[PDB]
Ligand binder design. Structure first.
Ligand SMILES: [Mg+2]
Ligand SMILES: [Mg+2]
Ligand SMILES: [Mg+2]
Ligand SMILES: [Mg+2]
Ligand SMILES: [Mg+2]
Ligand SMILES: [Mg+2]
Ligand SMILES: [Mg+2]
Ligand SMILES: [Mg+2]
Ligand SMILES: [Mg+2]
Ligand SMILES: [Mg+2]
Ligand SMILES: [Mg+2]
Ligand SMILES: [Mg+2]
Ligand SMILES: [Mg+2]
Ligand SMILES: [Mg+2]
Ligand SMILES: [Mg+2]
Ligand SMILES: [Mg+2]
Ligand SMILES: [Mg+2]
Ligand SMILES: [Mg+2]
Ligand SMILES: [Mg+2]
Ligand SMILES: [Mg+2]
Ligand SMILES: [Mg+2]
Ligand SMILES: [Mg+2]
Ligand SMILES: [Mg+2]
Ligand SMILES: [Mg+2]
Ligand SMILES: [Mg+2]
Ligand SMILES: [Mg+2]
Ligand SMILES: [Mg+2]
Ligand SMILES: [Mg+2]
Ligand SMILES: [Mg+2]
Ligand SMILES: [Mg+2]
Ligand SMILES: [Mg+2]
Ligand SMILES: [Mg+2]
Ligand SMILES: [Mg+2]
Ligand SMILES: [Mg+2]
Ligand SMILES: [Mg+2]
Ligand SMILES: [Mg+2]
Ligand SMILES: [Mg+2]
Ligand SMILES: [Mg+2]
Ligand SMILES: [Mg+2]
Ligand SMILES: [Mg+2]
Lengths: 62, 153
RNA sequence: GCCGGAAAGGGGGCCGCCCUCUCGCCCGUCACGCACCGCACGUUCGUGGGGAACCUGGCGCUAAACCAUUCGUAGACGACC
RNA sequence: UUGGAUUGUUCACCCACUAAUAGGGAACGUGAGCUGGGUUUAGACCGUCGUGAGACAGGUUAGUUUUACCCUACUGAUGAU
RNA sequence: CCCAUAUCCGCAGCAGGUCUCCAAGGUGAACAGCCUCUGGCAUGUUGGAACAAUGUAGGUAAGGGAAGUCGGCAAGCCGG
RNA sequence: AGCCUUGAAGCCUAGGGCGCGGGCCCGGGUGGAGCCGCCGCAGGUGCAGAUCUUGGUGGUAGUAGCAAAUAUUCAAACGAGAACUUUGAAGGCCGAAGUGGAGAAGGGUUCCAUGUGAACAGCAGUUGAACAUGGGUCAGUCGGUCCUGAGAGAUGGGCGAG
RNA sequence: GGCUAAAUACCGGCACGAGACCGAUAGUCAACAAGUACCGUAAGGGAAAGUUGAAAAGAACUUUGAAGAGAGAGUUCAAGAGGGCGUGAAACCGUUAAGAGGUAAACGGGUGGGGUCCGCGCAGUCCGCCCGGAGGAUUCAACCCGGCGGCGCGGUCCGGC
């Protein structure tokens, strides 16, 4: 357990990197979506998802 | 938190937990004993088949009135059911344990669900209405859950 | 190798040979072996029954049951065809 | 070892058929099996008794018949060794 | 605002109870029953699959016609 | 010149024992601040029951059940999520003594809008008469107000311990 | 016909002090937003409910999931104290370990089998005397000095009380 605590920073950094890669791939797929109506629906859902995350964060902070 | 069984090796073992999960405790104890030793791909596949009624859940300890099905002759039992709310609660929890073994860098395709127990949570209380002006309890039986997976190659 | 055994079937008799000793049994000669110093479950059936996993080879073996589906000679559900 | 008329009847009695229309038991078998005609609450009528309230194995009429999902037994249905 | 099979009283979003106003077309004697228009609703605290028994509520039964039962109870006949 | 933050009470204990027993002493754990031995004193002083009292929890049991009043179906939208929300198209019911449109008594914010999905709405809900925010009831002519009805009720008087 | 302080009474009121009292099912019904919530048309009836920690230092931040919920991280002596949070028993339940299983279970007497720990088992007691065997003291008896104490029919010593 002590070793895992020592290694704790590395695991968080790796987890953050894998989320950055997943987010980058999601943006690339949205960019690559040929149909403008599909692209808009995906973009609106992504933005609303972010907004829900922001509201949830603000509620937890409150 | 303080679990019941501690893993034999904390690095290659992931944990999960659930408190006041509005499921049925008897159903969750049975679909947890069905999962108790499986491999995590076997489990997610089984628990999806339970929701699609391609495999069942043998009801062994709480089997009053629990009718007989044909898909229980694989467990050498006669009675069984297809708990959907209870195959989806300890599937969102098997997903949580997956996303907790990736936070530890384990091999998700090598995880065996090693320890899994279901406890009994505080009952929530409602009331029904019966004949001759009598009111009765209509209490809910929630459960606590907690699993521990482990890399076992 | 041939024989005979079925009630819940005999590792028995016999044919041979190319093997090998005159020891095996009785009565004696001849000396020896831990003679562990008075002392308990010793001495067999026992290459026991079950269970694991190991080495070492020889010959060989590559299936079904259940579920899902289907049927209706069947059926509360299972079961059954 | 029966079908019916009368009676709440048990009993009894008669008609008809029949081989014969024997007797009985099982908490006077059997009300979470039924019915509720009788008996046996509260309403009322008549008779006899009592000054009276009331009484009458004396008649009359109307009168709520609850629950099994438990264990066993039994009947079927899975399965177990 | 509700004024009632969810805003009231019955412990409740309870088949109960609770005072009135207005009042279309057809059939028909008719404010009866049945279909419809205006207006309203989504089957009355849930759905899916089966189609066993025993129930609950409706039906129909050859021949006989109360032999059933304490008793024609129930059902049936009749019906304008 | 008792024990105690170098760990008191309490509780748990396949640990060691004592006593015929009531009971007791040690060890380990948990805990975190008070406690006991003796000689006397005092008492609201020892529980298995009382159809005991209060609280908690089981088997029954994932069982009974979620069956009065004919009935739902398709596509789309919102959404993490749709048998149940919303729109549209079908099919149906109520069938002017209505499941319509308005009022009295009663309720008291149930009204309207936006949001929420914890609890509740005996399944679910993206919905609600739920929850949280805010709004909303405008009178010389509509009623009350006024008048008497059945009746209630002062003064005078009478009665009365009051 | 009339008046009249003091000694005397006081489970209401204001303000006080105390206790061989109870210690949150006790003590007032009420330690707490208690004659409150609630019930009844009314007269009336009438509860349950105290405890995180020394200090909120009340868990930033990362992560899965829509969320509740978790997994990490951090605070603290301690979250094995995490907003109904001191300690956290019993019934009841879950899981892990060990054994067992057709006369319901349980039980008393007797053993045997297995476990769990303990003995901190695994070469087994010490003690007095004496004999011998090797060593080491500043050491015994007896005398002298000083102190202390006991006893003395010091037959009947001096002086006290
Ligand atoms: Mg059982
Ligand atoms: Mg049963
Ligand atoms: Mg049943
Ligand atoms: Mg009811
Ligand atoms: Mg009632
Ligand atoms: Mg009898
Ligand atoms: Mg009987
Ligand atoms: Mg009866
Ligand atoms: Mg009668
Ligand atoms: Mg009478
Ligand atoms: Mg219907
Ligand atoms: Mg309704
Ligand atoms: Mg419906
Ligand atoms: Mg006929
Ligand atoms: Mg005919
Ligand atoms: Mg007759
Ligand atoms: Mg007859
Ligand atoms: Mg009739
Ligand atoms: Mg014990
Ligand atoms: Mg006392
Ligand atoms: Mg007791
Ligand atoms: Mg059922
Ligand atoms: Mg209306
Ligand atoms: Mg209206
Ligand atoms: Mg509204
Ligand atoms: Mg619900
Ligand atoms: Mg004007
Ligand atoms: Mg007066
Ligand atoms: Mg005087
Ligand atoms: Mg004093
Ligand atoms: Mg208290
Ligand atoms: Mg207490
Ligand atoms: Mg009290
Ligand atoms: Mg208490
Ligand atoms: Mg407490
Ligand atoms: Mg502590
Ligand atoms: Mg603590
Ligand atoms: Mg403290
Ligand atoms: Mg605690
Ligand atoms: Mg076992």
């Amino acid at each position: 357990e002590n070793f895992l605590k020592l290694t704790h920073v590395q695991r968080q950094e790796a987890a953050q990197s894998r989320r950055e890669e997943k987010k980058r791939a999601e943006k690339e797929r949205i960019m690559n979506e040929e149909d403008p109506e599909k692209q808009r629906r995906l973009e609106e859902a992504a933005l609303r998802r972010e907004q829900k995350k922001l509201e949830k964060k603000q509620m937890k902070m409150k | 938190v303080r679990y019941s069984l501690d893993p034999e090796n904390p690095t290659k073992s992931c944990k999960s937990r659930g408190s006041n999960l509005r499921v049925h405790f008897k159903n969750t104890r049975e679909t947890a004993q069905a999962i108790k030793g499986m491999h995590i791909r076997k489990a997610t596949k089984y628990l999806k088949d339970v929701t699609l009624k391609k495999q069942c859940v043998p009801f062994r300890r709480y089997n009053g009135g629990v009718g007989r099905c044909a898909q229980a002759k694989q467990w050498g039992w006669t009675q069984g059911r297809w708990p959907k709310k209870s195959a989806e609660f300890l599937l969102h929890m098997l997903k949580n344990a997956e996303s907790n073994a990736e936070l530890k860098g384990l091999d998700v395709d090598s995880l065996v669900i090693e320890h899994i127990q279901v406890n009994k949570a505080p009952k929530m209380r409602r009331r029904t209405y019966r004949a001759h002006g009598r009111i009765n309890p209509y209490m809910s039986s929630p459960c606590h859950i907690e699993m521990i997976l482990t890399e076992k190659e």
